[PDB]
Design an enzyme around this catalytic site. Structure first.
Site, PDB file in Angstrom:
ATOM      1  N   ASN A 116       0.806  -1.224   0.000  1.00 49.21           N
ATOM      2  CA  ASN A 116       0.000   0.000   0.000  1.00 49.21           C
ATOM      3  C   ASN A 116       0.845   1.283   0.000  1.00 49.21           C
ATOM      4  OD1 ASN A 116      -2.088  -1.741   2.348  1.00 49.21           O
ATOM      5  ND2 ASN A 116      -2.404  -1.573   0.123  1.00 49.21           N
ATOM      6  N   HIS A 126       3.060   2.269   2.232  1.00 50.59           N
ATOM      7  CA  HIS A 126       3.276   2.793   3.582  1.00 50.59           C
ATOM      8  C   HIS A 126       4.525   2.161   4.119  1.00 50.59           C
ATOM      9  CE1 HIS A 126      -0.660   4.653   4.383  1.00 50.59           C
ATOM     10  NE2 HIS A 126      -1.030   3.885   3.360  1.00 50.59           N
ATOM     11  N   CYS A 173       5.791   7.490   9.509  1.00 45.38           N
ATOM     12  CA  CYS A 173       6.837   8.114   8.707  1.00 45.38           C
ATOM     13  C   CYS A 173       6.354   8.018   7.251  1.00 45.38           C
ATOM     14  CB  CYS A 173       8.174   7.398   8.893  1.00 45.38           C
ATOM     15  SG  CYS A 173       9.503   8.002   7.806  1.00 45.38           S
TER      16      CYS A 173
END
Ligand SMILES: CN(CC(=O)N1CCCCC1)S(C)(=O)=O
Ligand SMILES: CN(CC(=O)N1CCCCC1)S(C)(=O)=O
Ligand SMILES: CN(CC(=O)N1CCCCC1)S(C)(=O)=O
Ligand SMILES: CN(CC(=O)N1CCCCC1)S(C)(=O)=O
Lengths: 265, 264
Positions: free
Chosen positions: B186, B188, B223
């Protein structure tokens, strides 16, 4: 995983993991490269290696990768089973080659192939040398003697000479540095980390609209754990081609150079 | 891998790989953490998840990790087979917990254990919420109803509150940034990358003479792929350390945690 019937090649099946895939939910080229390393290690262990012989150990000689070439036709999806076959072949005093074939375990079709060129080096002085006759004889019993090439083609991509990228680079990723996860059991940077660093300077728009088909990487110098690298890329071209250079962030000493070929989704 | 007889837990065996081990030729804690994620994904898939329910999908709600706690007694060697068992449990309106037990496949001995605290969040606004009424009902059928805790000891290491490291840090690793390999499907940053970043500021002399026994990590903020992180560590003592990961520029906290190391 197991040695084949004749004992001259090794096969292993892998179930592609959740963290091993990218945005397309298929295995990244770095996951593929790690699986090639894994099936190579399992092959060496299966034929008696503790992949150095007692003579090489006595001389403090190790095997080092000079070139890696991977061509992927279809990346296995998350949850898929991929079967990989590997074998080695002597190339006289120059060094040795390890080849791989990747197949879909359901269809039996070839989904990818890879080849690597290896040379002998003194592990302490880092000096290169030809494969001695006595060392060669010790390895020949584990290799097919008739040629068995993953890339048999006339003027195939795996043997093309790679030029040096000239400044300014079209794209760049600066200040890349290895963390503990990038190191191997001997505290050296894993070969696969250099593939990742080469790819950091490819624009995200290319990654989103294209799939990586071919990657050829020359290994010139090892990145130490306290080194910092700059990754440089310039387009050289329905397919896109790029020229790559990884060099130390400060003085610009070349560590790797390479090329990639991407096909539009 | 497979669901157990009662269908309330999942087990999977893994052969430790050559690139998965550190200088001791045993699995790193990041390899362990990746295997916990893998056995958690295989559990969700086996019980019908495409790990969100259709109700959660209709509301754009996702599960997010608030805390990870891992305790390792023996790291499996290169080539060893480790069996991992995982299960989930509701914790009322607060959220849910996923627990894991690691065992040596040859001896049957427990070699490690882990627990994680999860909360629901809107994936678009990033706003938290308690379990939204009909949500815990759709999930309860997949969980044991009587308590089943990987860390049963009343008020043990997994529930200790973590304080904020004060400047100056004793040790630091600055300018850390994620590469594509650190991202998930995804785009991330993978939760396991934050464990690696916390450990970058531990001195190499500690890593060479000690083994990591316990790690507790609180997740405060994600982050982004274009963020740069600073990893900070201060000794608090076996050796114990306090950790902080914060954005390189403004110093916004992304994680905080503690580690306990046993002398070899
Ligand atoms: C050149 N590769 C190393 C490799 O094949 N191996 C390393 C150990 C010996 C055999 C296996 S790679 C895919 O870049 O990791
Ligand atoms: C260069 N290779 C060594 C090698 O030829 N051999 C090792 C065991 C298999 C065949 C013999 S490698 C890629 O480092 O394993
Ligand atoms: C908090 N973990 C995530 C996880 O276990 N999972 C993510 C996907 C759903 C279940 C499995 S971890 C080990 O740090 O990656
Ligand atoms: C918090 N978990 C979701 C959950 O409760 N469950 C769904 C999948 C297994 C049954 C239970 S998790 C770690 O995200 O999978």
């Amino acid at each position: 995983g197991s040695l084949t019937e004749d004992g001259l090649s090794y096969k292993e099946k892998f179930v592609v993991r959740s963290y091993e895939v990218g945005s397309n939910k298929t295995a990244t080229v770095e996951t593929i490269a790690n699986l090639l390393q894994e099936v190579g290690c399992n092959h060496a262990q299966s034929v008696g290696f503790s992949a150095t012989t007692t003579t090489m150990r006595k001389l403090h000689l190790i095997w080092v990768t000079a070139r890696m070439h991977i061509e992927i036709y279809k990346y296995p999806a998350w949850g898929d089973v991929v079967e990989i076959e590997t074998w080695c072949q002597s190339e006289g005093r120059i060094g040795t080659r390890r080849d791989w074939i990747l197949k879909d375990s359901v269809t039996g079709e070839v989904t990818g192939r890879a080849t690597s060129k290896w040379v002998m080096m003194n592990q302490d002085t880092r000096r290169l040398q030809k494969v001695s006759d006595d060392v060669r004889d010790e390895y020949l019993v584990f290799c097919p003697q008739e040629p068995r090439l993953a890339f048999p083609e006339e003027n195939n991509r795996s043997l093309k000479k790679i030029p040096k990228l000239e400044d300014p680079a079209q794209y760049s990723m600066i200040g890349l540095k290895p963390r503990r996860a990038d190191l191997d059991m001997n505290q050296h940077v894993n070969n696969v980390t250099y593939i990742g660093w080469v790819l950091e300077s490819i624009p995200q728009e290319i990654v989103d609209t294209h799939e990586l088909q071919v990657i050829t990487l020359d290994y010139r110098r090892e990145c130490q754990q306290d080194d910092v690298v700059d990754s440089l890329t310039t387009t050289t071209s329905n397919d896109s081609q790029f020229l790559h250079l990884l060099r130390l962030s400060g003085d610009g000493q070349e560590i790797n150079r390479g090329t990639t070929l991407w096909r539009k989704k």
